[PDB]
Design a protein around this nucleic acid. Structure first.
Lengths: 108, 138, 98, 94, 81, 98, 83, 108, 94, 142
DNA sequence: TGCCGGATGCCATCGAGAATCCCGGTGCCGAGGCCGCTCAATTGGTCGTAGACAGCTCTAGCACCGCTTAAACGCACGTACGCGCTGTCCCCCGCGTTTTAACCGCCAAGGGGATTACTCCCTAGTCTCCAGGCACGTGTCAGATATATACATCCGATTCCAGTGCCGGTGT
DNA sequence: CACCGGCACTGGAATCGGATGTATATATCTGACACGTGCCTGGAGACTAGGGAGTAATCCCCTTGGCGGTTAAAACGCGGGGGACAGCGCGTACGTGCGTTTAAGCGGTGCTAGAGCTGTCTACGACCAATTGAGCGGCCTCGGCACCGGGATTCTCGATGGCATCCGGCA
């Protein structure tokens, strides 16, 4: 027998292809599932996660912090147009609110 | 189907309602091409002897604004004429405001400005309007 | 005696509470309210702590969003104080009312 | 005593690649785990619909590619689709 | 348990409004806020109780709560699921 | 010599158009607009008549709803004339913009 | 052929009629451009979704089913056109 | 071989039990389908259709007409609270709008 | 080349309630959409509930819960009564 | 579980934003226990000879609202006194509004009402306030 | 009796006091690495079917052309509604003191969740087969259309006066 | 200039009154629907065979009370200023109507592009059996962050001195 090589390693990905394939098979989405779908889904999920984490890390660095807390995720999500559109109806626990005040309420 | 480089990042625009415009102490006297009504001794003397209501009507004519009783005499005395010329939209708009004044109020304004109280409404209007372009010591 | 003009302390509290992330409603009264409400649908029910936590987070987020919309409505009408009519208009436009 | 299933490690692996010296908290991973699941059901559900929609039986990369373009906004769709195409091409050649 | 809606005190509503950016508050807002909160809680709790009834259980888990919130289009993160 | 009072014909038109059911936009200009918009995404596209009909119906319903919400917002501010600020506020509260 | 300047096809009286169905009395002079922009955005979204749907099926004609399906996907269900 | 009886006749319904069963089994919803699900679903659908048709027919009678047109359906749906809540996000072709004018616009 | 509809069944119900009332062709296009639309909503909700508790079958209990979740207060009460009576009649008068 | 009969049908409630406008005009003041200032020939004669500003100040005193210049003379002439008695909250609230008027304006109001322009502020206040309860014809020939 | 007078009512700029940052010191619990294993992922071989590809047939979407006629387009006018200014008073904000119960740190008991074992009804898979539902053709009646008519508002004449320039005229 | 009269028009509200929009009553006319008929393929009936879940034990978490002890938050007055609300006046920008322009809808005639159908293979994913190492539960360790306090910087805001238009006298 040949030495085992994970499909994630074959596709150059970090997310597990086999786990996604099993979930698609057992999720009652369709009776037959193609060979290439798990690779595509894993790549898309990895790209989205990396894109969110980059902004979260930038926000955390801007606040003189090392570890990421949900407030940083909320700031990163609410400060990007595309991610805000994607997550319009999503509530993040312990996320807070973007600092904003109407200009009329400001003193003269 | 393969895109090169990174992805452009846009900024979210938030709807902000209009804040309007407000003024607290403008203290504005647009200086015209003439002498101040306070330097013309005779107009300063008539301005010192006239009632608050003539002064209110004159401040409404000059600055389109109701004047506070204390400021009212200072604000009229510091008028140096209008900065606009004969035939301007501002000249026409003042001429109509003069035509809309009661003959007794035009005669009171003539007496503040050392103008003759005699003649037709249209002449009192013309004589006041010429004097408010170039306030000349009589 | 030092005294502040009306308005400064409100802005200070706005800045303070727009920066932190803790819950603003005390836990025990909210727990009692949730249990009383859930009594009607079934008796002798039992609640895990995480369920009450999730309900509190959802309620706080919903109220904050509603108050933001109400503030927008009130400012649109050339005012600075919020009134029940603003809440009614916001709920009507959002689609939560017939 | 049942084994539990989550994406905790892979989010950590991605984080190290982008920010080598940035850590993450337990509460933060709770949000990230839900986000990955939420996107998974949205894309798969849309792709599942399309198969029954054109009287087809199998879900292949074309269904996932179209489902991505329907869900993601403008600029996200362009880059995500390119990312998937690169993965499939490398997998097929190997 | 009776008259528990009074537990949502006036300062709590004031703080919640201050988080949203409100500068001045009327005197009749509190009753309306209590009514709105009661209606929202009633809907969510009814859905969660139905969900936990179907499973023949007696303890409401947070999973039913987050799934109800998802049903009403109010997806919540960070509480499992 | 006989002139109708301003506002009267407006109410007559309101009562007339709140009862009828037919489309209110000319068909050919709408078809041209739809084809022009679609020509950007893909060239040489053909359309069925039912597709254009459905698009017109959905568009008219959406515009009517938006105008009703705008009327409510404009009435809120003690006015009877609708202005673009009302449209912007209605779209913001509805969730169609940020 | 190339089509250009058709957003002006939505005449001012047509916008007036649509507004009058909504129960408005007075319309300011700046409403029309804003309404045209909003309509353009909405049509752009729906038509993009319909074009994607008809592209996946390898067809060259946009069917009514694609339009109703896109409208359903956007949260605005339409009745009376087969779906 | 006895003479056949339709399941709708057995349950005393008018909607097709067999067609609903076939749609459920071919609809990719679950691996197996119980025996009593189609009966329940058909009963619920029949009840809802009967309610809507009764309201529409009452409206059409009120409008001095014999046949039912989409305007009557729109009126019936929009004038009932439960039906309006159920069909809040639904557009009916050739339906029109409910006659409603604000009080402020009405002249003194 | 065979197309199915709820044409005959909607007509049968209409004659039961209003003996002397007709219907137009366009009104029927709406009724077909309404019956289908409710069908996906109930089936979709009930399909999840089976996967929800790690179950493989859809029974009348799943439909009963799915109806209660989707319909408003008074509508849900009567719809359940209609379903319960029909199920009993089918089981008894087999 | 099985219920009897039809369900109860409920109506939809639509939001209406109350106008709180029109519903008649409150400019006209309530008829008091005295003679109209227009029937008292001498007060009608003084009212005909007085400037618009005395009339504005008197309309503000009587009806608490600014009067339109054309209505102003009619509105003051139709005043028949106040409907309230000495010591009422309305009497005290008018007495304060009189104390807040400049001495020259009280002397102008006395001259509209045929009251004597002489004496202390507090007496001009008392004399005007007694006259505004019961406007009496002063009997003095024009 | 009329000035006199100050004499409150009206603009300035502290520095106090409070609020808000910034940095050094200490602890602790949650985040970050190791270990074993066992179960989920990988590898190799079969096979039967879903999907790609190659024609044919028509249906209908596109394209061009008069025409007629209703809707769109300018243009003028005037009147109402939007908008700004002013005054008032009453309602909500800021602060000190007294209650009041939420929060926190343990004890304990039992209901109810979570996990195996058996089995037994309950539903998928096949063969017939026949009858309920779907396409095709039709004729007549309910709705659309056309006038003729009586009823319901709607707006601006009338008038009318109560008010009013200005005009014109006069011993001072 | 000043002073009066009469020769001038002048616009609020109650009262008829035509002009126009609209619902009602017959008289024709047509095409859409409710019905009838032939046919066909999908639901019914009769079976078999295998497993999904209902019931029964069994065990241990974790939910609910229960009890004290602080101490920060909530409730109650009490001034007092500023913001909501009403009233008024002014200006210009839309509503209404009329005359001139234009293209929308209708009917008609052709053309060919591709949507849908059928038939033929064939490569691919479900299925099964045998391995094996990847990730998860468990455990241990240390430093990032939460306080905690001492200074250090900044942001309002009610005191100084000022500036002329009242009020009641008094010689």
């Amino acid at each position: 027998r040949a030495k085992a090589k994970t499909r994630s390693s074959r596709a150059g990905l970090q997310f597990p292809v086999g786990r996604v394939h099993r979930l698609l098979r057992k999720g009652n989405y369709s009776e037959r599932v193609g060979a290439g779908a798990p690779v595509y889904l894993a790549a898309v999920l990895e790209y989205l996660t990396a894109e969110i984490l980059e902004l979260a890390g930038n926000a955390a660095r801007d606040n003189k912090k090392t570890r990421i807390i949900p407030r940083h995720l909320q700031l990163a999500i609410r400060n990007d147009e595309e991610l805000n559109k994607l997550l319009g109806r999503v509530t993040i626990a312990q996320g807070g609110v973007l600092p904003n005040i109407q200009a009329v309420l400001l003193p003269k | 189907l393969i895109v090169e480089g990174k992805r452009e990042k846009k900024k979210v625009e938030r709807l902000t309602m209009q804040v309007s415009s407000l003024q607290r102490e403008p203290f504005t006297i647009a200086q015209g091409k003439g002498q101040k009504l306070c330097e013309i001794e005779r107009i300063h003397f008539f301005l010192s002897k006239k009632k608050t209501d003539e002064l209110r009507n004159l401040h409404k004519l000059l600055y389109n604004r109701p004047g506070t009783v204390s400021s009212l005499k200072k604000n009229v005395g510091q008028f140096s004429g209008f900065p606009f010329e004969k035939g301007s939209v501002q000249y026409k708009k003042k001429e109509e405001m003069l035509k809309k004044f009661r003959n007794a109020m035009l005669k009171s304004i003539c007496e503040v400005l050392d103008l003759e109280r005699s003649g037709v409404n249209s002449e009192l209007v013309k004589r006041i309007l010429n004097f408010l372009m170039h306030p000349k010591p009589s | 005696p030092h005294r502040y003009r009306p308005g400064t302390v409100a802005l200070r509290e706005i800045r303070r509470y727009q920066k932190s992330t803790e819950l603003l409603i005390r836990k025990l009264p909210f727990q009692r309210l949730v249990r009383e409400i859930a009594q009607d649908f079934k008796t002798d029910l039992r609640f895990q702590s995480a369920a009450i936590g999730a309900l509190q987070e959802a309620s706080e987020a919903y109220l904050v969003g509603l108050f933001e919309d109400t503030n927008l409505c009130a400012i649109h009408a050339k005012r600075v104080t919020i009134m029940p009519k603003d809440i009614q208009l916001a709920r009507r436009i959002r689609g939560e009312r017939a | 005593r049942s084994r539990k299933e989550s994406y905790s490690i892979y989010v950590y692996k991605v984080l190290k690649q982008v920010h080598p010296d940035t850590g993450i908290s337990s509460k933060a991973m709770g949000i990230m785990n839900s986000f990955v699941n939420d996107i998974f059901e949205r894309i798969a559900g849309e792709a599942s619909r399309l198969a029954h929609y054109n009287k087809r039986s199998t879900i292949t990369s074309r269904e996932i590619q179209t489902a991505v373009r329907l869900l993601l906004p403008g600029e996200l769709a362009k880059h995500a689709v390119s990312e998937g195409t690169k993965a499939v091409t490398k997998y097929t050649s190997a | 348990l009776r008259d528990n809606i009074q537990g949502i005190t006036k300062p709590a509503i004031r703080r919640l409004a201050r988080r949203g950016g409100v500068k001045r508050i009327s005197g009749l807002i509190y009753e309306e806020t209590r009514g709105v909160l009661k209606v929202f809680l009633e809907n969510v709790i009814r859905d969660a109780v139905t969900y936990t009834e179907h499973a023949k259980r007696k303890t409401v888990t947070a999973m039913d709560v987050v799934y109800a919130l998802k049903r009403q289009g109010r997806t919540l993160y960070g509480f499992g699921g």
